[PDB]
């Protein structure tokens, strides 16, 4: 009914974003493990697998977040990478 139409129209899915690490030929594998542990709360085993995905697949998804939180993860990870003088790029794509 009218109430039911109002309900339908308020069920637009959240805008979510994958946060992604992109491979490069200069960033140490150990540093990527560090990144995944420090900023994404991965245990060492899971961090190591994702890091290997970055290296062998070209990129890996670190997790999926609201747009606001995703932009905050990207900013932090890149800052941490630059201050350690690595080119590691963390970016976003809409899920």
């Amino acid at each position: 009914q009218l109430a039911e139409e109002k309900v339908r129209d308020a069920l637009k899915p959240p805008s979510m974003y994958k946060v992604i690490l992109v491979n490069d030929d200069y960033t140490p594998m150990e540093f990527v493990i560090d990144v995944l542990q420090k900023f994404f709360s991965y245990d060492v085993e899971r961090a190591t697998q994702l890091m290997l995905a970055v290296h062998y697949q070209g990129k890996a998804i670190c997790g999926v977040f609201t747009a606001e939180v995703a932009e905050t993860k990207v900013a932090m990870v890149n800052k941490y990478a630059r201050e350690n003088e690595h080119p590691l790029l963390c970016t976003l794509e809409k899920a």
């Binding site: 491979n23 030929d25 140490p28 594998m29 150990e30």
Partner: peptide, 11 residues
């Protein structure tokens, strides 16, 4: 990415 130097077991 860059793999770390392996640490030799045998001397």
């Amino acid at each position: 990415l860059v793999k770390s130097k392996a640490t030799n077991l045998l001397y």
